[PDB]
Symmetry: C2
Subunit: 313 residues, 2 copies
């Protein structure tokens, strides 16, 4: 059968569970994770402060979660290099992107991601919110004169090593940094997504920056429909259309959380990421009601739910 037809068959039956699958919440421990997944959430996020026993404690780690929940779900982490977190004592860390491109070859970085990704996979991570593809992050510090082709080359290698061991890489943060106008992003920070999305299977995460000339004035990109339409169409130099899953950056570090979740989904996101402090049920209430009222059109919601289900096939 067709993979899409198989995923369509895995879309949840109840509408509350359909919209819940479009959300991904940061969790602090095993209990919070199980409570979120029992409400239908499509995935959980392991944050910098997340209890490390959730990775290592037998009977109360990710394998136990998959046991207690009889469905497929995503497990994300932010493992991009050069940043200590609770999970570092367990899983290690990449160097900072600047150190990797300064001192290693693209082949070493790809081989490094395969090895480190092996430890991530063995602990039940399925999504890594990395690599950064910001051009200046892979270059030397201090408008600038870094090379987008370098950022594209190393990000592509990094992502290929993760994919070899079954970890979905996610390029971030679309459409890039340096608030410079869209035209200036198209000749610089947008270039790496070209090679990134045409040579790997990675997903994309949209950031909160406000881009003059993209969509509506003063609106963060993560909740502006023009951002997602740009990603879908690929209408930028070197861009290729993208029909995979689009994540948001953490909507809590941006509105109320529930309104921000709905705002991002309505704009075109497939996975609304945020650090849940208990408001998950209120968000599901608000988003399910928007589908019933027509504020969130049903076919857009179901098209996103199909993209989410394709992750598990």
């Amino acid at each position: 059968p067709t993979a899409e037809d198989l995923a369509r068959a895995q879309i949840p039956e109840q509408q509350r569970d359909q919209v819940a699958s479009l959300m991904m919440v940061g969790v602090a421990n095993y209990d919070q994770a199980l409570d979120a997944l029992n409400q239908g959430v499509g995935g959980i996020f392991i944050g910098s402060w997340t209890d490390e026993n959730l990775l290592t404690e037998p009977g109360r780690n990710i394998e136990a979660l998959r046991e207690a929940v009889g469905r497929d779900f995503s497990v994300s982490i932010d493992f991009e290099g050069g940043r200590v977190q609770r999970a570092t004592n367990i899983l290690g860390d990449f160097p900072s992107p600047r150190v990797m491109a300064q001192t290693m070859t693209p082949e070493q970085v790809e081989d490094l991601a395969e090895i480190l990704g092996t430890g991530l996979a063995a602990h039940g991570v399925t999504v890594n919110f990395a690599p950064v593809v910001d051009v200046d992050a892979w270059g030397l510090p201090v408008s600038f004169s870094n090379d987008p082709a370098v950022a594209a080359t190393y990000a592509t290698a990094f992502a290929k090593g993760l994919s070899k061991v079954g970890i979905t890489p996610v390029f971030k943060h679309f459409p890039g940094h340096g608030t410079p106008a869209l035209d200036e992003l198209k000749t610089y920070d947008l270039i790496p997504y070209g090679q990134a999305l045409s040579e790997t299977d990675g997903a994309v995460m949209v950031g909160h920056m406000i881009v003059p000339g993209l969509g509506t004035d003063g609106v963060p990109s993560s909740i502006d429909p023009a951002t997602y339409q740009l990603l879908r169409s690929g209408d930028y130099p070197g861009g290729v259309p993208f029909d995979g899953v689009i994540y948001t950056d953490d909507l809590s570090g941006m509105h109320s959380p529930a309104e921000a979740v709905l705002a991002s989904l309505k704009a075109g996101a497939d996975q609304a990421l945020w650090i849940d402090y208990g408001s998950l049920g209120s968000a599901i209430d608000r988003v399910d009601a928007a589908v019933s009222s027509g504020e969130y059109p049903q076919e857009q919601m179901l098209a996103s739910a199909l993209r989410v289900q394709l992750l598990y096939i």
Copy 2:
């Protein structure tokens, strides 16, 4: 012209510089490091106590130290995985040794150490106080539980990876963390040193633990001469004689189970080649204390110079 001849010729001229070459201190920043190095210290130790700019700031990094100081010197770091006491975050980190053994092959661990070591080398590191060879660090938590052959296999693979990129690995902590009696260590925590010291060029760090059945009752291993004699002779199951450089664990934190200048002298007298400590305020005092001990014969001159030769060999 042998390798040992070339190193013997680079041994410092004055006796004060000779004994100071047997010391290695933690440094807080570039200005402190350059001041330590102009006092003749053999090497510096980068850690969580160190200004991160010392690794990165142009004109104030390690490369700039090597330009300001004529002679060769060592730059150590503790970069091992699973420890919170990290010098910096820009270099990445290994997974914990348990995670490495659980989830990766020894071929992956070797290649991992070669890759991460490349970043360490490009920032001026020459010595890495890793790997731990304790059997339980490489196995599951304790319920003869874990297999010393696994610790030996992975610690050896880890060490070979660092060497490929010019970083000296240091096996630690001799004669073993776990305090069980020497006879017990001989059947367990001492086993990995056999493969480590016969298959690699790694150095060895002696710890501070008090081992019953080894030397004087109640004396930490780092200042007991019997620890170093055991390491030199390889007088334990599977052990080979080791004539490389022997480090002490951080002398500036030896616990109350037993002054800084006296600790340096005691560890060198006992057989160490590199007296290591973190709090650099006592460097001048230690140079004075050990220098006078060589003049008075308390620290025999041929022992001190043999150690100085081992140290110079790291640079040839």
